[PDB]
Amino acid sequence: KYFGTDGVRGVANQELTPELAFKLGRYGGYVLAHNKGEPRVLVGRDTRVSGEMLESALIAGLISIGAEVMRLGIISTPGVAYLTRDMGAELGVMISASHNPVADNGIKFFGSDGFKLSDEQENEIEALLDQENPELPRPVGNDIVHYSDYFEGAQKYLSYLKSTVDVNFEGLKIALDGANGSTSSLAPFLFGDLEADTETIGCSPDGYNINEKCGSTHPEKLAEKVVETESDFGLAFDGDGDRIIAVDENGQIVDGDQIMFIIGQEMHKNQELNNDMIVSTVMSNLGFYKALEQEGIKSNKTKVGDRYVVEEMRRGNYNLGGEQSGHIVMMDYNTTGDGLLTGIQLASVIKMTGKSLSELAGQMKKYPQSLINVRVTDKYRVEENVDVKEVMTKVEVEMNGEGRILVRPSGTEPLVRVMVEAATDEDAERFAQQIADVVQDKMGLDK
Amino acid sequence: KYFGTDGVRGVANQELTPELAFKLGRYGGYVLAHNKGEPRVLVGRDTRVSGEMLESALIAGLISIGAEVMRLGIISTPGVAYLTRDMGAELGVMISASHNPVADNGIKFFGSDGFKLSDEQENEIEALLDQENPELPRPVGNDIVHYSDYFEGAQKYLSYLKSTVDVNFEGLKIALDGANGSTSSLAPFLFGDLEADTETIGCSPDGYNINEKCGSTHPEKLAEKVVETESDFGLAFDGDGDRIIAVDENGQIVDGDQIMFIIGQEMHKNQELNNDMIVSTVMSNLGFYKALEQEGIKSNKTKVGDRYVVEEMRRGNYNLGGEQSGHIVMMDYNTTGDGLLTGIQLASVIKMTGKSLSELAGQMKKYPQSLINVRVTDKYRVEENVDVKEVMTKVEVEMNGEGRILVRPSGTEPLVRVMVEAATDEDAERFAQQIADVVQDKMGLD
């Protein structure tokens, strides 16, 4: 299967080749081009050098079927999602591998509604990939259209982001890390235009340095800068700009759960939070759930992955959801995780309250976590297994209520993931080992 | 066999697909550009839509191989050839189909020396196209290079063209037809910068109007303009600007043969002509050859085609050669047929003498041409046939000096081309039909 969890990803020029990018543009176009005359498609990318070669290969595929291609250049993945629906386009494509290093690259698609592709269409694309020679339209002469360069899209996206906040950031000092990625050209202008004084790092891309000791994945240098410049707070983005991780005034790190809590707290007070609930994955820390209970906010847990958070939010029409990693979705403004949008909305809360990030983030304490992997036969049996159930109960019994345990299998791998959250590092490691031991003896294929 | 007479030509997205353009960039790049670590290749195109689509596919092939691509945008084919030599670039690529209509497009390659590919280089590329899975370099990470835009090149090409002339064009009013091609943005500036007054048509390309009722192939619209604007003369260009056709004061057409004669005449007296000779194809009219006898110029005849003209020019190092179609090569300045260069050099001769085109064109008379194609059973028996030999032999005797018949079979298709050039139309058809009648009786179809 070419399509993975989040589009088609591989190492650029061997696993993900220009020939594949051409096929994805031609086939992906036709699947999305059987429903409109003279299809309009927009394509964006991040700062990887391999994006230039893949884009030209992809654009050739889109043109070869008759589409009107609109090159956005360097833009964040949410920018593609927003522009696609706002311009009424049939499809949007983002070329990026997010946090992965420069060698890797990927191709992501967006529908006319700003959402990821439907699986029936994803499979139809793959069915065309299976055919050695599929007959397809071959427009000639006047039937081919001129593509256009839509340099306006980046600022049109930025102006929309500016519209969401209702106050400027004067009096705030903010440090930004663009991860040498698509945000490098967007975050300095966006916050600078809102009157915030800015200190920047990771905003000098060269085509090979994306996500190199910078970004949401590596926030240390940012925390170093925030303390050095005595800034009020700092924000770190990833290569394609769908995730954000924050740093407070003292250099402590604020994860997605805390950011989700701060923003959901303010939405709750203003009664803009839909159904007084926040969607999230179970991987979020226990302290996050208890803080939501204190604030009277119902919590909904879903399986790990962007697919399921957004899936759940659409089903019930919830306006806020996200993951601990920093991938946070605000339905009222965008249809996918947007680090830039989440960043300004966080800064808005800091401006209105007159507080600091450490105080707003300090509202919830994160319990220590211990994680263990056990290579088992058949992953469904684990929680049906009697011995596994009983030790979990004992562990559950021993913690009066101060902690929780999670036993989940990973779809990518053939092993189970033992997650324990407890009051103390030593407790968390101990309950995890007790549970992992029981699984290892009775479920360890790879004993 | 993908390669034709002038590179790979076909209808864009049907005969030649972006998939093919990708392979030509990937395979052609490896074969022709790899004697340096990060080869530098230059890419240009004309105004046709699909030039955008084929370019992106080609550039992907070049990058996937490790090349440093430098886009030139819209430029004439000689511009690519000239720039490739001046920049020390490993290879140059031009995306165009020349005079052909908008639907067609093509890919032509240039070596570091500014010359088209050798048949050996042509053969090697086709072998890679045939291989099911050839293992070629696949650079990853830092190994891939950034492509770049060299739009500055177009003005450097124009400044170089200005350098070739030693005098201005003040006092001249010139009409230009750009064929909605690459010359559309270059010829008005080039002649205007030389102080000539300009009236232009066919300089409004929209991607679908190239070579549409204008250009070297269609000079009727320009000749109309020359008379109406009361201009001294007019110049017509093709889609990719490797050909030139001129129009006199009265609207008559001046072909490549006459343009070659005018330019070679001035070179000869000034002794700029190397070995006092001009290279040309057999397709050239006899009046061109007779005028060369009146002057002190020798002449070499070669097989039809751009390649063979320049090939002969390199072997003996002659500086002037061309075709009747308007594809003319000036070795001292460029390595391929350049319509813009020839346009300046033609006008340059006019200003120095102070004469007009009609007087310069009248130096040679064009004998009327009659062309007939006959379906045959085969051609390799047609030259041997006695009845054909007998009518042709009778023809050689009847015209002691009246002209010449040329009989040339096509390997491509099973017909014989019967061409006769004679003093009067009435003579030629007496020879053209008589010969074609004899050929028709013997082969083709019972």
Residue numbers in the entry:
A (entry chain A): 3 to 40, 43 to 451
B (entry chain B): 3 to 40, 43 to 450
Paper passage:
In the human pathogen Staphylococcus aureus, c-di-AMP is produced by the di-adenylate cyclase enzyme DacA, which is thought to form a complex and be regulated by YbbR and GlmM, two other conserved proteins. GlmM codes for the essential phosphoglucosamine mutase enzyme, required for the conversion of glucosamine-6-phosphate to the early peptidoglycan synthesis precursor glucosamine-1-phosphate.
In order to gain structural information on the S. aureus DacACD/GlmM complex, we first set out to determine the structure of the S. aureus GlmM protein in isolation. While the protein was crystallized in the presence of metal ion and substrate, no corresponding extra electron density was observed. One GlmM monomer consisted of four α-β domains with the fourth most C-terminal domain linked by a flexible loop. A sequential fitting of the GlmM dimer structure followed by the fitting of the DacA dimer structure into the SAXS envelope of the complex with Chimera yielded the best fit for a model with a correlation score of 0.9196 in which a DacA dimer is positioned on top of a GlmM dimer. In this model, the active sites of DacA protomers are occluded through binding to the GlmM protein, while the GlmM active sites are still accessible. Upon binding, GlmM completely abolished the activity of the DacA cyclase enzyme, while GlmM activity was not significantly affected upon complex formation.
